[PDB]
Amino acid sequence: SMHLTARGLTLDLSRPQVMGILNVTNLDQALQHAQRMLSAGATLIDIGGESTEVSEQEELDRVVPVVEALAQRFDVWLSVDTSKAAVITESAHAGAHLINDIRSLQEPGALEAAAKTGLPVCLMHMQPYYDDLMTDINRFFQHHIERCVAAGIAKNKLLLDPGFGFGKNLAHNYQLLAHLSELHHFELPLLVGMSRKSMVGQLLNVPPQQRVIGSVACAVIAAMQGAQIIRVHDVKETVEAMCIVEATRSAK
Amino acid sequence: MHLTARGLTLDLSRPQVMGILNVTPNLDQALQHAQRMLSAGATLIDIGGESTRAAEVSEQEELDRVVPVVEALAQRFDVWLSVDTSKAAVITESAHAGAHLINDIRSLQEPGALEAAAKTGLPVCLMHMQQHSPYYDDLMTDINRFFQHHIERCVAAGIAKNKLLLDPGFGFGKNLAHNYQLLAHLSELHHFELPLLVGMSRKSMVGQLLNVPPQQRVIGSVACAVIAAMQGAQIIRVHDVKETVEAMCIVEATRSA
Ligand SMILES: Cc1noc(NS(=O)(=O)c2ccc(NCc3cnc4nc(N)[nH]c(=O)c4n3)cc2)c1C
Numbered sequence A: 001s002m003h004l005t006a007r008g009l010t011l012d013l014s015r016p017q018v019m020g021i022l023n024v025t026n027l028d029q030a031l032q033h034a035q036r037m038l039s040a041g042a043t044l045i046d047i048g049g050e051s052t053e054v055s056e057q058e059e060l061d062r063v064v065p066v067v068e069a070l071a072q073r074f075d076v077w078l079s080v081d082t083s084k085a086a087v088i089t090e091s092a093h094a095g096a097h098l099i100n101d102i103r104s105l106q107e108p109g110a111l112e113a114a115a116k117t118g119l120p121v122c123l124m125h126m127q128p129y130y131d132d133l134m135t136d137i138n139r140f141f142q143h144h145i146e147r148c149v150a151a152g153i154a155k156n157k158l159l160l161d162p163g164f165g166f167g168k169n170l171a172h173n174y175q176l177l178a179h180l181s182e183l184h185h186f187e188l189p190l191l192v193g194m195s196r197k198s199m200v201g202q203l204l205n206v207p208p209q210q211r212v213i214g215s216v217a218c219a220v221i222a223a224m225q226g227a228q229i230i231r232v233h234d235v236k237e238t239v240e241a242m243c244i245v246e247a248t249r250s251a252k
Numbered sequence B: 001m002h003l004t005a006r007g008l009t010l011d012l013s014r015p016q017v018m019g020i021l022n023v024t025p026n027l028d029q030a031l032q033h034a035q036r037m038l039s040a041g042a043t044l045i046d047i048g049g050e051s052t053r054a055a056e057v058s059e060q061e062e063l064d065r066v067v068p069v070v071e072a073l074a075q076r077f078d079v080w081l082s083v084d085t086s087k088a089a090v091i092t093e094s095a096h097a098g099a100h101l102i103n104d105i106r107s108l109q110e111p112g113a114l115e116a117a118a119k120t121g122l123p124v125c126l127m128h129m130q131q132h133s134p135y136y137d138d139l140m141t142d143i144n145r146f147f148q149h150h151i152e153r154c155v156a157a158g159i160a161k162n163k164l165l166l167d168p169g170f171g172f173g174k175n176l177a178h179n180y181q182l183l184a185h186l187s188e189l190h191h192f193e194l195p196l197l198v199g200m201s202r203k204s205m206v207g208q209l210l211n212v213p214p215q216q217r218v219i220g221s222v223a224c225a226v227i228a229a230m231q232g233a234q235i236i237r238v239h240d241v242k243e244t245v246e247a248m249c250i251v252e253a254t255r256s257a
């Protein structure tokens, strides 16, 4: 029904999009891994310097060369998983397409830097107790959506992530997964990250490397509920699953 | 509710995985594979002496493949045993061996099949079917009319309504568009108030989309299983049990939330 655009490049959101995770914790490995994910069918590459502290220069040193190298190398959406205004701006210079912040630009100067770039930004819900899980998330997004538009970032440039595994217990996560379709009322793209998280592990009683099937199953359930972007470790498997999903949905 | 045979119950509040146990071109290997699938979490084992994908099979030949396996499993394991047969002789003999469920793609239309199946008193699964290019005026209506027709045949024959299972038959006289049309509208078949069994594992509906060989169709098959189970499909017929079982755990947890 819709699409999102950056730097003359467009991301089709009528179909589920797979975002490959590229955590940095060697430049050569990063470029090659990105290549592996891209061929696997990823339409976005997410570069993250923190795992949910890191120094500003240290985080910048890891992130921006990878962004620039990929920007030169491939015509693909580039996303930086950062919460730092310096990293926001520097990545924009490097050629990043999307700003993905788990802290929702609440760090000092982060909001202004993001606004100046004009790049699309993804807002993620974060805190364990909830009176009503879904209501809290809806209220959270509404607040920062109000804030983002106020900052001069257009509403249609925003993405929403309910933030699986962030200040949420096992029951909450699957409650969220079950009611995920409700979040579409914002008429904004939904991005979800469930890959290899505890919500899979606790159920299957398997280590992270054995959580591929569980992660994909979650991705399929989310995508069947209209989730547009899926953030995963295992791109190829997720891409294959999304093909089944898209064929099913297109079949009406 | 549950499905019942010989004092065994199958919980239908949760998705059940039926492991595929083909016995075609050693009993020892079959038992190891079945036990492995059993270990993976399968609650049903489907034993087939015929290939529905094919050269025909003799009555004695199919019997030779099927019944020793059924007898072997019945003693060794407490699991639902399903026989994938269209032959009254195989139906009757397998029932003697201790089979719990009759899975017939041809819906008991072979000679004497209906009568033989009825006498066993065992639950039966009916499957919709149609070189010919698959066409439907309306796929779901055609399937609904098919099930309505054969359900009456079974009931008239003396097979109780609660003993019946319905399979829309993925990949049987259906093209790629048809199969996913069926998957999308699968929930509609619940109106018969009968358990639904689906078989999409490693089938062309996955293969044509991903363009990979059968052994590499695991993820696609699991994706189909999840979608079907989310639409309330009770029994899933798969080659890869462990992966499907893990997926069903995510599905059941999601629904139970
Ligand atoms: C220790 C320890 N390690 O993991 C856990 N448990 S956990 O639920 O699986 C878990 C929770 C969170 C994460 N963060 C990973 C992560 C990173 N970036 C993201 N960006 C976006 N936009 N959306 C996301 O969802 C997201 N998630 C990784 C693992 C414990 C406890």
Ligand SMILES: Cc1noc(NS(=O)(=O)c2ccc(NCc3cnc4nc(N)[nH]c(=O)c4n3)cc2)c1C
Residues within 6 Å of the ligand: B052, B053, B084, B103, B104, B105, B125, B127, B167, B169, B170, B171, B172, B197, B198, B199, B200, B202, B203, B204, B205, B237
């Ligand atoms: C030849 C040839 N080989 O594969 C194809 N394409 S196919 O769609 O993948 C395909 C089609 C049918 C099968 N038969 C396998 C099979 C056997 N018994 C079943 N019993 C039940 N209850 N339900 C089932 O779905 C089912 N499926 C296996 C593969 C053709 C055509």
